[PDB]
Every structure is written in C-alpha cells, then in structure tokens.
Amino acid sequence: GGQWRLQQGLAANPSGYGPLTELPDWSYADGRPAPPMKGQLRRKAERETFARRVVLLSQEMDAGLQAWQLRQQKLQEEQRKQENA
Amino acid sequence: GYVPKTSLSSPPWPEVVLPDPVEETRHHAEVVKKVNEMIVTGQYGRLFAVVHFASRQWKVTSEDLILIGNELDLACGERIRLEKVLLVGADNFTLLGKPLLGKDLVRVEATVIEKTESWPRIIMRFRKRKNFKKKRIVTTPQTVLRINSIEIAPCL
Amino acid sequence: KFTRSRIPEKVFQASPEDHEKYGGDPQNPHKLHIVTRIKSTRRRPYWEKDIIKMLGLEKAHTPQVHKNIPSVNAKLKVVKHLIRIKPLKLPQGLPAEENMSNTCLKSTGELVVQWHLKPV
Amino acid sequence: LRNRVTDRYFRIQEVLKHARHFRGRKNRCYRLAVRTVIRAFVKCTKARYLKKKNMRTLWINRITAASQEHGLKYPALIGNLVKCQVELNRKVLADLAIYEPKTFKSLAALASRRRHEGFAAALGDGKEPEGIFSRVVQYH
Amino acid sequence: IPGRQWIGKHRRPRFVSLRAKQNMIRRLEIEAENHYWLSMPYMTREQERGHAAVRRREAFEAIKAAATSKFPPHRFIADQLDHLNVTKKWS
Amino acid sequence: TYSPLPDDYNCNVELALTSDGRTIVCYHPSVDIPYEHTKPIPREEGPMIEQLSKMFFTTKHRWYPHGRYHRCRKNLNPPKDR
Amino acid sequence: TARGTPSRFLASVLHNGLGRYVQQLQRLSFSVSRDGASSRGAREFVEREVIDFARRNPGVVIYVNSRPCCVPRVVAEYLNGAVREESIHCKSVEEISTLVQKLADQSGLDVIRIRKPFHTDNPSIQGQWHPFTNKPTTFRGLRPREVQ
Ligand SMILES: [Mg+2]
Structure with a gap:
C-alpha cells in the first residue's frame, strides 16, 4: 500500500526512511546506546553528500x-561612458 | 431523489452507522483505563512481542531463540534491550503502536548465546554450451539470541 | 528509419490550467530538480543510455538533484520518458554546515534540514 | 610418464560425496554424477528465490484463509492495516493467524473499522471530521 | 496459428486488458508532469553561460592530474627482508 | 451498538486508542461456550485396501507398500522440536 | 545442498541463556611444531596471543603440545562432547585470533543446516487455532439437518 504512503508524506516503502529503519535496533541493558548500524552510517553519508x-x-x-547581472551593469556602463567627447 | 426498493436500488452491503466520535472517545477512555488496570494489577500472564529487529519482524516470547544472519559486534552473553517492538500481546489484551511502541512502555531483553557461522552454502552458476561453470562456497555469520524477558510498563 | 526525435517548443509551454493542476509558479520558478530514473534504459537507443549515464541516473528509484537551466533541461528533454521530474522545494532554508548531516529528503520533494525521528 | 596424477581418487570423491542419495548410476559413476551434481547445485541456488517466493505466497494463503474466517478478504485486510500505520508484515500476520487468533481477530476488527471509516469518509465528501482510527501520526 | 506465434505475417492476436490501459495511462500522467516541470527554467541560456566553467575546469584538472600521476609503486627493504621469516624457528 | 466484527464466537474485541493517539489498545476477553449450547455426553490385499480406503476416505495408492529403497531412505530418527 | 546434508532445529545446550550464560568451549588443543614453516603463525600466536586469550576467558583450559607436527591443528572440545578439529596450517596470527575466537564464541552443536531461524517452546499464548475457533455455537449443540 505505497500510494497511500505517498499521499501521507511517508516513504513509499515502509523500509525506507522513518522510524522503522532509522532508530537503533538495539541497546545495551545498562542503557548504553549501541554503536551505529552500518546501513545508517552509509545512509547518512548518502544524505550528507546529497545535501552538499x-x-x-x-x-x-x-x-x-549575480555574475550575469554584473556583466549587464558593466555593459550598461560601457554604453553610457562612451556617449561623450 | 427517492428510489423504490429494487435489487439494484440499494447496495448489496448493509449500511453501517459509525458511532459518534465524542462517545467513542469516551469508550476509548474506558477501555484504556481497564487495560491499564490489568497492567497495574498484574493480571496478565506471559507476553509476546513482535519486534522489528534489523532484518525483519520476529514474533517473540520470553525464553526463546532467534537466529540472526549477521555478527553484531557483541560478546557472547551480553544483554541487549531490543527496541523497535511493535506489537505486544497477552491472553486478554494487545497493544499495537503506530508503527512502534514507546520505549517507556515495553522492555524486551535478550542475551547473545552463540556467534556461529552458517552451514556451507554453495553458489553454482552454469550456462549450457557456453563453458560457463562457477562454484562458490559461502558461510554467512550468525548470532543466536535468547529473549530473556518481556516486561511491560503501565504507561497509557 | 527510427531516428532521434525532436520536440517543438509549444510542448514545453505551460498553460494556466496546468499551472493550477500542478503547483507551479511561472513567475519565480524553482531552482533545483529532483530526477528519478523509473524506466530501464534497456530496449532504448544508445543516446538515451548515454544521457542517463551523464545525469547520474544509473540506479533506478534514486533521486538526483540537478539545475533548472536550459542545458540540463535539454538533456532532461531527451530522456523525459525514462525519468520523473519534481521540483526540489525547501520549507526551511538550504542547510548550513551546522545542519549538514541531520537532513533527510522526503518523498513529497522537500529537504527537511532538521530531521528528528520523533512524533509531533 | 614423468609426473602422472596420484591424487585423483580424492577429486572423484569430491564430486561423488554429493551424489550419495541419487538414483541409478548417478550415485556411482563419475561421468553421470558430475552432470547431476552440477545440476543439483544450480537448482540449489536458483531455489533460494523460490524459497522466498513460496513462503510469501504461503503466507498470503494463510492470511487469506484466516481473514475469510472473520468476513474480510485479503486486500481489505492488508490495505487497511497499512492505512492504520500498523506495519506488521505477512510472516507475523500468518503467525498470529495460526498461534494467536484473538490478536488476529482484533487486527481484523481494526482493519474493518478503518475500512468503514474509509467508506464513510469518501461517502461524505467535503470537509468533515476525520475518523478516530483514520488519524495519522506525523513524524519529524 | 500459422507459425511462430508472435513474429510473421499471420501473428496471433494479443489484446489490451484494463491493466495495460491503466499502466499506460499512469505512465502518460507522470510524463505530462515531466512536461510541466521542464517548461520553466530558472535561467535563460544567456544567463547560464560560464556559471560553472571554473568548477568544470578544476574537475578536469583533477581527472587529468589523476591520469598523469601513474607510476610503479615504491619498493622497500623491509618487504624483501621480511620474506626471510618463513624459516623462523624456536629454540 | 456498532460492532466492527460480530463479537459472538472467539473473543469480545474492543478497540481503543490512547489519548495521545499513538498506540491501539485492543481488549479481548475470551468468549465462553454457553451451557445452553451443549449436548450431553452419550452413554486379502485388494479387499483390505478397499476397506481402508473406504474407512479413511483416501485413495487406494497409499496402502500398497513401497520397496527397500524407500524404506531405507527414510530418516528413522528425525529431529524433534517443541 | 540441503537434501544431501542433514538438518536440525535451532537449540542450545542446557538453556544456555536463561539463568546464566555458560561458555560452551571446554578445551583447546594446539599442536605446534617447533621447527616448521607450517606452524609459524601458530608459534607467533603462542608467543603473543594465547596468554591474553587464556586470561580473557578462564573457563577454557588450553593445551599447547609442541610436538614435531607437519600440519598444525587446533582441537576445540565442547561441553556436550562435540570435538571440532580445525587446521591452523599456514595461517597468520590475526587469522588464528579470529579462528580461535570463532571457536570460542560458538557451541558444540553441529554446523549442519538449521531448519527454522527461531525456537519458541511456547509458541501460542492465546491458544492455538483449531477449526472450532472462529465458529459460533448453536442452541442445544445442533448440527445442520438435525431436528431434535
Ligand atoms: Mg508456429
């Protein structure tokens, strides 16, 4: 049911982005968070190079x-400054 | 806009009347209150959780086993809290979240027993009359997890 | 002979029925395209396979940001049957170096530069 | 012969140990056993895709049967469990359909409740208050 | 059928189901939205001219420089002497 | 008075959302069988294979034996589970 | 293949995780030649790493034999009587640390195919399906075409 998920702003595949695949899968029982998942590290590298x-x-x-606009202002000043002598 | 009651006049399914949302939200307050009473009073027996551990969704009791198909860079014997649980049921109630449950609500614990390899697994490719024959032998890593407890917390 | 195909310019001139159907603006258009290859370039000519390599669309169902400029749009007009084009909209601003890693592009087309995993 | 092959018994026994359960002379003679052992390995690798496929169609048969017990059909059940953001998969729902049928009955009532909220929702078009189970949880 | 069903003069007929019509239609709709978003460039062709000539020049300086820096690797004494430990003993 | 399923045969299904609207609390006690819905407790090779086939409603073929090759491929100590 | 190889169910030894975790590996038996290039990385394993390994888990007792062998072996013996003999012939020190740590991590179960990826012993909690779940009873227990 992925067309519904596209209508709701979710990923079309529930294994895509979101809470099922981007939270950590497990933690220590002491409370220490796990070292990060390999696919979450690779995936955040993909999102970072995408943002770059x-x-x-x-x-x-x-x-x-802005470089075009400065070229056009210099062309207008080369139009105006030769209107003499 | 009246139509006499023929066969194709009215649809073949019965017309259902959904309840009014005010009284139905009050009914949800009553049911959530009762199930919170069963969690507080300890009426429930043993639980099961559907937990979305890495690869898939494992249906899980306490005192059971899961064979995962990867090494998790953990020692044999270390305790794990499995987050991403997404269904918790007892004999007389369940608790299914959208899509996951609260970490303050369900605590699923599991130790690592054994970090084995798989049985050797043959990957042969062969195309006829083209002299194309390749053989590979692959053993994936595996860890086995003993789910020690599914504890549930009266937070609704 | 099946040759390369040209497309006249009236095909790429939008109408106010189209400006009301799709949420675009002719005055102040969008800067960045999201392009997604959704049709295999096999059983297609070699020039289309080449353009799909030039746009970085070798994997299917992977978004790629391009510029909304007539040269990039000329390459996109070659392979417009193989891709999906959406504007890159940016609700919050384009991300700074502080918010550089904590981004996520949503399926709607927007790049959310503060991406928690928490419900509202 | 300066150097002729001594270790040849073990190559024959590398192939023939996989043939020990075949019929005919395929378990015995090397010329026949190479073809049937190669062929058994090609079937062994192409059957992993068929293992995944046949498990999934088996789960859709089990979810189909146990949802016909509660009056629903399969596409109403799956589409309307998707539309509740209850993203249980086919394996879990078949296992609840077998081992825990109260939970599957409550998932059937949740899915049919959401189906009727979709019917009454698309029935009264325009702005109306949304269904109670029809609300979505927005993540950010 | 006369021969080889799907090629030839007398081919067998194949007909367009509702699947194939709805598939072709939704492909045409995705196509028409591609026709919408290609109708409004952010620059004219004059304005885009030379806006990335520096970055393209430096990119080909990187490819050119990666091509002209190809040479045999360094050869060390510790590798060749490190072979001698194949007869390392105990005592 | 609305019931999404006819809560009459397996368990009384009562659906609920929490007030934060994130989990679906389902409550389902087991339906007992009523006492009024109950009855009191009442107080040669060819012919043999037709008699077993007619007895267990299966065809004749699974009663004819199978040879030594199939009796000695059978795993006689299969793995138990559960 | 899987039809030529035996299979088994996913289990543990004596409910290896429930109360406490017990190391399933009793003995390692290294046999390492003093003079010989086959057991070079074994020797460098005994000089460097077998002591720190022997201290990281004291439930394992280790027997380095140091005889004139021509192929070095390690013999892992497990609590359930299983004996897995693997060769450390011409393997470097790191590869013997991963090999010995692999033998330490696992158990004395066979490395044959495992049928199911899971093992509940109490699979059903709400009661297993039988065909009379999801069927309503009728009055007086009557069956169809029964009058009285
Ligand atoms: Mg023909």
Missing part, C-alpha cells in the same frame, strides 16, 4: 545570476 550537492548547485546558480 544541493548547497553546491544552489551556490553556483546564485553566483551565476
């Missing part, structure tokens, strides 16, 4: 627009 790509692409987009 989102930031990197967003910064290239903003720097690209």
